[PDB]
Amino acid sequence: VSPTRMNLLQRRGQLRLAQKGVDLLKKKRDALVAEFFGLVREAMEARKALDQA
Amino acid sequence: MAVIADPETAQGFRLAGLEGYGASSAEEAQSLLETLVERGGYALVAVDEALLPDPERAVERLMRGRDLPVLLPIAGLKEAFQGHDVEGYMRELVRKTIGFDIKL
Amino acid sequence: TVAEYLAFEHDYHVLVILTDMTNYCEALREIGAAREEIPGRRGYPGYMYTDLATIYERAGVVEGKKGSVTQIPILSMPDDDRTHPIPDLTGYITEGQIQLSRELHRKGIYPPIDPLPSLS
C-alpha cells in the first residue's frame, strides 16, 4: 500500500467497518441461537410423541 | 416410502403403503441402501438406531449435492418395550452443534 | 535534438525510445542535492516537473510539415508504486500510459498489460 495520509485515513475507515461488521454478525448469531433453542423444545416434543406412538 | 427395518415391521409399513425390508446388519444395510437411494423415488427413509446410529456416515458419499432423502435414526425392537433416552440424544446433538453441553 | 531535426527538416517519421527515466531522475536528484535545492517529495528537486516537461513536450506533429515524432519512454515504478514522484509527474505530463502487471506476469501471460490502469 502506498504510504500517504489519504491511505492512512482509508485504512482507518476499513478498520472501523471491520469492527462494526463483527458486532453485527454477533447480533445475528444471537438471534439464531434464540431461534435454535426455541426449536429444540418442540423437536424433543415431537420425538416424545413419536416414541409414545 | 422406504424403511430399512425388521421385516415384521416392514409388512406393517406396507400396510401404511411403505415398502420396507432388512437383514439385521450395518454392512448389508449400507450396501443395499446405495441402490435404495439411487432408486430413491421417495423423499425419506428410516433406519433403526441399532443397525447403525448415523446414516450420514453411510449415505453422505452418495447423497452428495442431493437433499431429498432425509435419513434419521428410529426406535428399534428393543425400544418396542423399553423406550428411549430422548434428552441424552438431543443434548449430545446440541453439544456438537453449539459447541458445548447446555440446558443442564 | 537529432529526432526533431530529422522529423522537421527531412520529413522522416521518427520513433524515440528513452530506455529508463528513473536513472535520469537519479542523476537529477544527485546534482540537485549537491546544490541544496528545495526538495519535492522524496528528495527529488522541486523543478523536476519543469525539467521532465522540457523533454516530453518535444514531440508531436507540426502544421504544414510531413514529419512526426513519437515518444515511448520506459520507466520502472520503484516499489510498483503508482504514486512515486517519477511515475506521478510523468503521468501528469504524457498522454496516457501503458501499465504492466506483475500478477499477470506471474500467470505466464505475455504481454502483461492490464487494461484498467492504462490510458490513451
From Swiss-Prot, chain A:
UniProt superkingdom: Bacteria
Record-stated family: Belongs to the V-ATPase D subunit family.
Function: Produces ATP from ADP in the presence of a proton gradient across the membrane.
Protein name per its UniProtKB record: V-type ATP synthase subunit D
Upper taxonomic lineage: Bacteria, Thermotogati, Deinococcota, Deinococci, Thermales
Whole-protein coverage range: 4 to 56 of 223
From Swiss-Prot, chain B:
Keyword set, alphabetical order: ATP synthesis, Hydrogen ion transport, Ion transport, Transport
Disulfide feature: none
GO BP, one annotated term: proton motive force-driven plasma membrane ATP synthesis
Family: Belongs to the V-ATPase F subunit family.
Pfam family, one: ATP-synt_F
ATP-binding is among the record's keywords: no
Record's protein name: V-type ATP synthase subunit F
Organism: Thermus thermophilus (strain ATCC 27634 / DSM 579 / HB8)
Role description: Produces ATP from ADP in the presence of a proton gradient across the membrane.
InterPro entries (alphabetical): ATPase_V1-cplx_f_g_su, ATPase_V1-cplx_fsu_bac/arc, ATPase_V1_fsu_sf
A single GO molecular function term of this UniProt record: proton-transporting ATP synthase activity, rotational mechanism
Curated annotation (Swiss-Prot), chain C:
Domain of life: Bacteria
Record field: transmembrane: none
Signal peptide: none
Protein family (similarity comment): Belongs to the ATPase alpha/beta chains family.
Protein function: Produces ATP from ADP in the presence of a proton gradient across the membrane. The V-type beta chain is a regulatory subunit.
Name of the protein this chain belongs to: V-type ATP synthase beta chain
Source organism: Thermus thermophilus (strain ATCC 27634 / DSM 579 / HB8)
Whole-protein coverage range: 240 to 359 of 478
